Amino acid sequence: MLGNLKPQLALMGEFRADPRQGKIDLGVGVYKDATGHTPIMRAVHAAEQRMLETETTKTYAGLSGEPEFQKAMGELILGDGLKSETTATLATVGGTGALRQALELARMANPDLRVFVSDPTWPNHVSIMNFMGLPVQTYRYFDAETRGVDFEGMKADLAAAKKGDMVLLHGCCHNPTGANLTLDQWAEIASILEKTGALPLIDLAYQGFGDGLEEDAAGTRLIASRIPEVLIAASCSKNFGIYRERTGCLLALCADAATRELAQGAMAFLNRQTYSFPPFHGAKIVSTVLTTPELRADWMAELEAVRSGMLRLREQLAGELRDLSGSDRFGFVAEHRGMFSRLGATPEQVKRIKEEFGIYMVGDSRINIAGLNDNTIPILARAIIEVGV
Amino acid sequence: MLGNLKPQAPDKILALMGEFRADPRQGKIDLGVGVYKDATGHTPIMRAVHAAEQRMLETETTKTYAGLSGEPEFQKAMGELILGDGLKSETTATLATVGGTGALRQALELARMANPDLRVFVSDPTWPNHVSIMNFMGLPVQTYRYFDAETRGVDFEGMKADLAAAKKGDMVLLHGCCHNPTGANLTLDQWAEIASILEKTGALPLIDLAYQGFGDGLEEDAAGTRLIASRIPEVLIAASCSKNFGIYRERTGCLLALCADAATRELAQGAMAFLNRQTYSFPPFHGAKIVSTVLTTPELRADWMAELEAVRSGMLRLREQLAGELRDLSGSDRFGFVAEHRGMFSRLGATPEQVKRIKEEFGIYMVGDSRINIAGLNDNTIPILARAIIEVGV
Ligand SMILES: *Cc1c(COP(=O)(O)O)cnc(C)c1O
Ligand SMILES: *Cc1c(COP(=O)(O)O)cnc(C)c1O
Numbered sequence: 001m002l003g004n005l006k007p008q009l010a011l012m013g014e015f016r017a018d019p020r021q022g023k024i025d026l027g028v029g030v031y032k033d034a035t036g037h038t039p040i041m042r043a044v045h046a047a048e049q050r051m052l053e054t055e056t057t058k059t060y061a062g063l064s065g066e067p068e069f070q071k072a073m074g075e076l077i078l079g080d081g082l083k084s085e086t087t088a089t090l091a092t093v094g095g096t097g098a099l100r101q102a103l104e105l106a107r108m109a110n111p112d113l114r115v116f117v118s119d120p121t122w123p124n125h126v127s128i129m130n131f132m133g134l135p136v137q138t139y140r141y142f143d144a145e146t147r148g149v150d151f152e153g154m155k156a157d158l159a160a161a162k163k164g165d166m167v168l169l170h171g172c173c174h175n176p177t178g179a180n181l182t183l184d185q186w187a188e189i190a191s192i193l194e195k196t197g198a199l200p201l202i203d204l205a206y207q208g209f210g211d212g213l214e215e216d217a218a219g220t221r222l223i224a225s226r227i228p229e230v231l232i233a234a235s236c237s238k239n240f241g242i243y244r245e246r247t248g249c250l251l252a253l254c255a256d257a258a259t260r261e262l263a264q265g266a267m268a269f270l271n272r273q274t275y276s277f278p279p280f281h282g283a284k285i286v287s288t289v290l291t292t293p294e295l296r297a298d299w300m301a302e303l304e305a306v307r308s309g310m311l312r313l314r315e316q317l318a319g320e321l322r323d324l325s326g327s328d329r330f331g332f333v334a335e336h337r338g339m340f341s342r343l344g345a346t347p348e349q350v351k352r353i354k355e356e357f358g359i360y361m362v363g364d365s366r367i368n369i370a371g372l373n374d375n376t377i378p379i380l381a382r383a384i385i386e387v388g389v
Numbered sequence: 390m391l392g393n394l395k396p397q398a399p400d401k402i403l404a405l406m407g408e409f410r411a412d413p414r415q416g417k418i419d420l421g422v423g424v425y426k427d428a429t430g431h432t433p434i435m436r437a438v439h440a441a442e443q444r445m446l447e448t449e450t451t452k453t454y455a456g457l458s459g460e461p462e463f464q465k466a467m468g469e470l471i472l473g474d475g476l477k478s479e480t481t482a483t484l485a486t487v488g489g490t491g492a493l494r495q496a497l498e499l500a501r502m503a504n505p506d507l508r509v510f511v512s513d514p515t516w517p518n519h520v521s522i523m524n525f526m527g528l529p530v531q532t533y534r535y536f537d538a539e540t541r542g543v544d545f546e547g548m549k550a551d552l553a554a555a556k557k558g559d560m561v562l563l564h565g566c567c568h569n570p571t572g573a574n575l576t577l578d579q580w581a582e583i584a585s586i587l588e589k590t591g592a593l594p595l596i597d598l599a600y601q602g603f604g605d606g607l608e609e610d611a612a613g614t615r616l617i618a619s620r621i622p623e624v625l626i627a628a629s630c631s632k633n634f635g636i637y638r639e640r641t642g643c644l645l646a647l648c649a650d651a652a653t654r655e656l657a658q659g660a661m662a663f664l665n666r667q668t669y670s671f672p673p674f675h676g677a678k679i680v681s682t683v684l685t686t687p688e689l690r691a692d693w694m695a696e697l698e699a700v701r702s703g704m705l706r707l708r709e710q711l712a713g714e715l716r717d718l719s720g721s722d723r724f725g726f727v728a729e730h731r732g733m734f735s736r737l738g739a740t741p742e743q744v745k746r747i748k749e750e751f752g753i754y755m756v757g758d759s760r761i762n763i764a765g766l767n768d769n770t771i772p773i774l775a776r777a778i779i780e781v782g783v
Contacts, residue, residue: 008663048446242452244673280638
């Protein structure tokens with residue numbers, strides 16, 4: 001029967017096929033340092049050395065994840081707003097597993113839900129939704145010309161969200177646009193959600209890559225304080241640099257202790273029916289780092305150095321661009337926050353840059369500024385200006 | 390809206406675990422445990438596993454995203470460990486999964502994709518998780534006789550009669566070895582008959598192989614799977630590294646799809662990768678890397694096999710001791726099946742009423758279906774378990 005299956009990356013091969021020295025791969029989705037490497041964070045390495053020395057068994061652990069991991073992540077994300085008596089926590093297989101589990105959880109509570117996503121959004125969001133058969137709706141977000149947020153459009157579309165519907169919001173560092181909401185915009189969003197009774201699903205995958213650990217969780221913390229029920233899918237892949245360990249977390253904020261129990265039970269059940277227990281290693285690294293003072297101090301230091309480094313890089317790009325353009329048209333570059341940025345260029349311009357200058361971006365013109373370099377910056381700027389973006 | 394979320398039932402033994410703990414009796418015994426336990430009541434980390442992690446600590450340079458279907462090294466090593474030299478790489482699709490449970494879930498999603506009208510056949514009895522998952526998916530479930538309550542062995546005639554009803558496209562779930570919870574297993578000749586019935590019906594076999602190496606040996610325990618694999622053109626294999634590598638919490642499993650031709654292998658491999666992506670994206674690296682390190686490193690594989698063997702042999706001597714004790718007390722050989730059962734578990738065949746009678750009078754705990762864990766026994770516990778069994782009229 002397997003022959004009845006339908007035929008369920010290409011750019012990479014195409015990139016590999018390019019013989020031209022000077023190939024620039026800006027389409028990468030992971031952090032990269034000056035020498036094109038994704039290192040293991042000092043604290044993470046120290047945590048693994050410590051773990052190998054203190055673990056005396058690998059027997060089955062907790063179905064919903066370890067309490068130390070659940071608490072540490074709850075505090076990292078919610079800070080002082082962590083109301084554990086009404087918060088259910090589920091350790092998942094990365095942030096993607098968190099989002100998946102979120103969708104299943106919400107669907108169990110509402111077989112008739114629709115999901116609102118930003119235009120554009122992380123493609124893996126929609127593929128999972130389609131695969132689940134969930135109705136997907138979009139809301140305006142990225143303003144093509146100003147390369148910022150189209151907040152008026154966003155307010156217009158979200159206002160139509162119905163009770164029980166879900167609104168997927170990126171907590172910070174919007175993937176792929178790079179354009180983000182301000183605390184004032186976040187507050188207005190909370191008003192809309194409150195009026196509509198739409199459940200918010202916050203995708204927090206880049207806490208620490210925008211303005212700082214605490215600053216990047218501001219919008220999330222605000223939504224959590226205004227709305228009684230909210231779901232938050234967090235990933236430790238990027239900010240802890242443990243992409244392959246598959247460490248993530250799903251948090252369900254409930255109106256009371258009773259609902260918290262329902263949610264927690266259904267969340268654990270969801271894990272049990274999908275793969276039983278969640279992977280221990282990556283989560284153990286995270287809680288060790290977070291609960292050990294000298295380790296957290298160093299993880300913060302390193303993460304801040306990464307963050308500051310990226311800002312420095314995109315400020316140079318903005319400058320280089322401004323000089324060659326004689327205007328601050330590309331100012332948005334230094335204003336965007338995160339690892340990615342959409343240049344707002346057309347598919348035509350994108351391929352023209354690839355074939356003529358050897359710069360590889362994602363079709364929608366998404367570039368990973370971490371993949372840049374002070375030597376690469378001038379070349380990229382020339383390409384943009386020359387191709388007439 | 391989270392308020393209209395129906396209550397979800399807790400874990401099966403969870404309650405029994407709490408019941409055991411509350412018991413104030415000095416000398417109570419727990420045989421309901423579902424993991425290996427050594428003489429000292431611990432679940433140690435295998436030597437080769439500890440050594441592999443040490444190697445990884447010194448050699449890994451990055452933690453970037455790796456393979457969506459798992460690492461090639463792991464895929465190859467798992468395929469070879471299970472199918473020996475008969476591994477036709479050209480026609481097998483492989484997928485690293487979150488444990489054996491994840492491989493089972495992925496297999497059911499894969500099969501359901503290829504045939505939306507499939508029914509699954511599970512043994513009577515079988516691992517509870519099997520039914521829970523299928524019930525969660527809304528898959529039709531059929532049963533085939535397996536455990537013979539009177540002889541504690543396999544009711545082969547019943548099994549054959551029930552499986553003969555499987556239609557083309559139906560799925561039959563067989564345990565590769567060490568049947569959990571019964572401990573009763575098929576002989577290679579019985580597997581051969583099973584192969585005939587499956588060829589005849591055109592039903593897809595799904596092999597749940599979680600205890601390779603805990604029965605008669607690493608190669609021996611895979612004979613059944615290999616026979617099926619050689620005679621049936623399309624096979625599904627859900628393997629787990631939890632028990633035989635002792636990495637329960639690292640969540641390391643494997644789903645192998647044997648196909649008739651390369652073209653179909655492509656279709657399956659693509660659908661399998663797609664399944665990982667839509668569930669949790671990339672699979673967990675840690676456990677799979679320990680396993681591939683052990684299997685591909687001469688000294689490690691050697692030490693690992695040596696430790697597994699010591700475990701297997703130890704459990705077997707325990708079975709011998711229990712059976713001997715049972716024989717001396719009963720003045721018969723009714724309990725000879727204990728020395729014949731293979732695996733970590735064994736269904737004694739006691740009724741629920743007898744099981745609770747055993748707990749109340751002798752302070753011995755076991756799963757409500759009379760499933761005991763052989764690894765929980767020892768020189769002191771055996772005599773009491775034997776006397777308990779007999780005193781309750783089992
Ligand atoms: C990285 C990322 C995730 C999750 O990644 P995982 O590898 O599954 O941790 C989810 N959403 C967005 C927008 C991301 O960028
Ligand atoms: C242990 C076991 C599994 C898989 O366990 P995982 O912890 O998910 O690796 C699958 N089937 C049976 C019969 C088992 O005993």
